[PDB]
Design a protein around this ligand. Sequence first.
Ligand SMILES: O=c1cc(O)n([C@@H]2O[C@H](COP(=O)(O)O)[C@@H](O)[C@H]2O)c(=O)[nH]1
Ligand SMILES: O=c1cc(O)n([C@@H]2O[C@H](COP(=O)(O)O)[C@@H](O)[C@H]2O)c(=O)[nH]1
Lengths: 257, 257
Amino acid sequence: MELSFGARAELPRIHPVASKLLRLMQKKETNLCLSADVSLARELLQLADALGPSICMLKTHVDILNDFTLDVMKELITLAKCHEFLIFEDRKFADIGNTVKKQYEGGIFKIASWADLVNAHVVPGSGVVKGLQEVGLPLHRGCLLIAEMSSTGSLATGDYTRAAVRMAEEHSEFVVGFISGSRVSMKPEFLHLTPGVQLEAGGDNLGQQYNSPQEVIGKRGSDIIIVGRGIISAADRLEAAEMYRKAAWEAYLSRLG
Amino acid sequence: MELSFGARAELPRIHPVASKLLRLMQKKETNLCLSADVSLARELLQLADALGPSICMLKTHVDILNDFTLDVMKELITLAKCHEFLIFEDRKFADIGNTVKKQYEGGIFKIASWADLVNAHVVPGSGVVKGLQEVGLPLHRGCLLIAEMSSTGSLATGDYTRAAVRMAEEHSEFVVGFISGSRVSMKPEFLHLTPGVQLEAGGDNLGQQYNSPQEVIGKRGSDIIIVGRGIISAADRLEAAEMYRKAAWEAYLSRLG
Ligand SMILES: O=c1cc(O)n([C@@H]2O[C@H](COP(=O)(O)O)[C@@H](O)[C@H]2O)c(=O)[nH]1
Ligand SMILES: O=c1cc(O)n([C@@H]2O[C@H](COP(=O)(O)O)[C@@H](O)[C@H]2O)c(=O)[nH]1
């Protein structure tokens, strides 16, 4: 009863952004999201161009880009369209609804104008989603809810994770899935994206913890791996991305049987 | 055994940023933080100048400022120095440590260069604080942890709130207090700042809930009220700020006896 990405793209209740994503994952044989955690626009764009064919999604932190402009993001959209990947701004909205709507639409980043996907913490209660969706529904955007975190001491466990799943499942006109370590919803209309991924065991010195693509996708049932330093600190980022793509894709196929 | 703000400023374990704040609160008879939730730099600066004498702190959301530049923030520092208030960027850092350090120091906002105080959600675990403090300790900054939220459905309750208090109390070289609805720590070295404040009962249509300064300061034991729309939507923002200042200050005095 587990469906391929291409069949999930057709589910009756699928969000159009999720459907677009699932179709390109199936087409390109990729369930890799690049975490493009760089500070230079040129590096961001060169990574997006070279790695675009290997990825289903490019995750940004626009607020670490020392030379952000909206024209950078126009360039990034051109590459996303060319290579067929979604743009996910990993802003982690986490305020009351009236504040996050402004943070999403406005200021100098105008996130909603260029990001297919954003994400939110569930700690404020469902007003965080209601505020975002007042901006994002008109613009045909989607949102991911942070149900679990990869870092040591995370409080996104137990009843908190359950609250995130309920909040999704109840805002499914806008919420398309989760940031999580594992499959947290049994409804196949929801995407699961998992950060904290490297091929080798380890972590960082600021609480990051790594698990492998086989563990995350194959054993824990997630859909997509989010990989930053495992790719971006490598010398050859293209070959690193291909290693991660092949790992995540085979883990998905093997789970699917 | 409850101490005045001026005596708390002298406590052995007080953080220098908390001490500076407590001294100016005592001097100016203000425990009001203006939530300057505007999109124009000119309005931000005109509010800071006119209301500066009435406030202990000005809370920003730099990411909704349509015409942000670092020169705006230089102007804002000049006013903070003139009128004696701290600048609190309400960024709600909420990522792994390695990410938040970059978000705090870098990008176009360079938050650490101008904000006396920032805040963080505790959901990622203590690496969020460790990452921020790698930037903020050298720059002699402070941080507030979000222990409770004002909005409907908040998950910052129970064991989550307790985890926030522990995390503070254990990073007290950098963490100076809390965003909370009430006094959550019994240690008087920690500040309690409470949003969701208006004189009249009510809320908004996106989950905000209001309580009065007398309730928050006088009954719930908080130190500082954070007020946005109750001031900024009023016609005369100066008189509105004075009403809130007088309310919060008298509630503090009456609690102190
Ligand atoms: O639980 C979570 C949620 C995240 O978004 N992230 C993000 O995913 C990326 C992980 O990067 P890296 O692979 O270099 O550790 C970072 O951008 C981080 O902000 C995470 O690491 N853990
Ligand atoms: O629990 C919390 C935490 C906050 O920082 N805030 C912030 O405090 C301010 C409240 O503004 P207002 O008084 O207009 O409702 C907003 O900037 C909001 O982001 C809040 O309302 N509740």
